[PDB]
Design a protein around this ligand. Structure first.
Ligand SMILES: Cc1cc2nc3c(=O)[nH]c(=O)nc-3n(C[C@H](O)[C@H](O)[C@H](O)CO)c2cc1C
Length: 109
């Protein structure tokens, strides 16, 4: 319930599902928490989303690395917006690197 959109994913589970989002995520994206928990966050992506940026994100996840990218996303009502995403391992010392945390900043249209 912080003053910024935050998400946590269990990247050890198939397709790296979201396990937690906060109210700021709901307000930015237009998706209810019920609708997104258990799904990979890429439901926010679409036709204009850059594949290079998506692959930088995937690579960071595979190598348990921090990453920052500005990516084109779509709200539930279909409005496109620029999402400045910063994410990385939740737990620096976890050799198994199970969880990833990300914040999203709406940079507009
Ligand atoms: C914790 C976490 C948060 C993410 N948040 C977003 C997001 O807000 N928008 C997006 O397009 N991709 C997001 N992704 C990336 C997406 O889920 C997927 O990993 C990449 O598109 C690479 O396939 C996030 C990934 C993780 C692990």
């Amino acid at each position: 319930r912080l003053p910024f959109s935050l998400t946590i994913a269990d990247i050890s589970q198939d397709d790296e599902p979201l396990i937690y989002v906060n109210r700021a995520f709901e307000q930015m994206t237009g998706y209810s928490r019920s609708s997104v928990v258990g799904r990979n966050c890429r439901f926010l992506q679409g036709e204009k989303t850059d594949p290079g940026a998506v692959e930088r994100l995937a690579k960071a996840i595979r190598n348990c690395e921090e990453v920052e990218e500005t990516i084109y996303n779509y709200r539930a009502d279909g409005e496109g917006f620029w999402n400045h995403l910063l994410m990385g391992p939740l737990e620096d010392q976890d050799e198994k690197c199970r969880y990833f945390v990300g914040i999203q900043v709406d940079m507009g249209q």
